[PDB]
Amino acid sequence: ANIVGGIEYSINNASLCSVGFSVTRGATKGFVTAGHCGTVNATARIGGAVVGTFAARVFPGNDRAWVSLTSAQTLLPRVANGSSFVTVRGSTEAAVGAAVCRSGRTTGYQCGTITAKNVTANYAEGAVRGLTQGNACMGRGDSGGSWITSAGQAQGVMSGGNVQSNGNNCGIPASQRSSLFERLQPILSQYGLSLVTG
Template sequence: MSVSISRQSARKISLSACVALAAAATFASGAAVAGDTVDAQLKFAMQRDLGIFPGQYAQYLATERLAQSQGRAIEREFGSAYAGSWIERNADGSFKLVAASAGARKSSSIGGVEVRNVRHSLKQLQQSMDLLDASSRARIKGISKPLTGVQSWYVDPVSNSVVVKVDQGALDRGIDFVALSGADSGSVRIEETPGTLQTAATIVGGIEYSINNASLCSVGFSVTRSSTKGFVTAGHCGSAGAIVRIGGAQVGSFAASRFPGNDRAWVSVGSGNTLQPWVSNYSGGNVIVRGSTEAAIGAAVCRSGRTTGYRCGTITAKNVTANYAQGAVYGLTQGNACMGRGDSGGSWITSAGQAQGVMSGGNVQANGNNCGIPASQRSSLFERLNPILSQYGLSLVRG
């Protein structure tokens, strides 16, 4: 069996200075408006964490809008050869939208899209992903060989592979897991990554709340269900009925919760509480929540939580399966904004104010966070917001 193994998760991607004229026109026409729509504190955080400077905001936002508006169209155009799309940064600091094809396609009819030819289609990669998930679900506690050391797995269109992340020194366990699953080893890459995968609720995280006066997590986003007020958060933070306090005052309780399998929950609060369409930037201000449109791989995204505050990074993978000690969680999104224990349930939001999800977990080191791990090796996982809203019949509070 041949499994491609990398000891560093940094992806070496060939860069191109080629940008289609149609995209250039879009960037030019939208530059002033796009630049003005970015919150000042968010600009600071994007510059600090991502190196996106003032002159680059408008071009980045235009690329983000192109990814959101044309993602489905690219998938339809490429058909069965479609192998994913993502936002990528050029060597000169500009951004572009890349689409991959497992066919012989050399270009796209959609302006501003760079096409790359790859070996595996997204469907083929998903087949390997499905086999890994099925193998995880079929394990019997106390009988099956433990998956200790295997952190997570997901389809990565950027590297055109299914990435299996393992603890440092646990490569053999990753190889065994892939072999037993029956997944195509030629489509799998195993990566060692620092830290160990943990949920982030052990010590304490948006703004902080406590559960049954025993543990701490972070508020995700304000929501309503008919006339009932509440907020979404991570399922591992508390079970249905658990009492929630903010600032020492009892505000409500967990109305529903699911973990593992998923990591989603919502808390109902009393009518006397005020819901705001904001995410704290931990600098004395707030980012306004505008909606919940999901961003593309490569898009800038920031997260807010009580332990590490407001941190930014990019989306690096989608549909990630996390192998927590309590059981596997499926369908997570991975970013590289740093996090720590206590940030659980906290908000993930884009530069345009689009709510993405709630903090689930990450490859936490002994110091309780993964901020000391290079961004290229950082796994910070969040549960997508829209499925939470759909499952529980919730409406997002927007500004």
């Protein structure tokens, strides 16, 4: 399969999540995503076919993971924006006040701004501290998906948000949205990953 940020993938033929970013660990291919999406060596599928397994994860506390893909997959420096793409050009972290979009299989491509950093998410499983908060909307299934600026700087992966009764926070104004992402840089360094760029 072609590995593009924001696309859908299943875990052990059960839950769905979204791809974060294409990365390599030496000769190994892979993609970063959210830690709550899978467990150590769980099987990931795209298009109903096996693509790789969860090589590592940290959830809760943090919310990160990377899926180790077989050589058959094609890594791409892309993030889905409708039928088109946003090129991944780097990983410069944007400051509070910056615009930033996100990509996922449920709400697609959504944009907003960064309202805060070092935010806490007291999830059902436990706390997840150190997250960054934007006001772009999101919903159930967007987890693991890419957060990237329109300039192409990869920011992190979708962790969680104040989901309303229908499942997302797109129905309420940005002023009420708490959409949270796990910063990309600590994921890259912890697992010795290199971001695939174009």
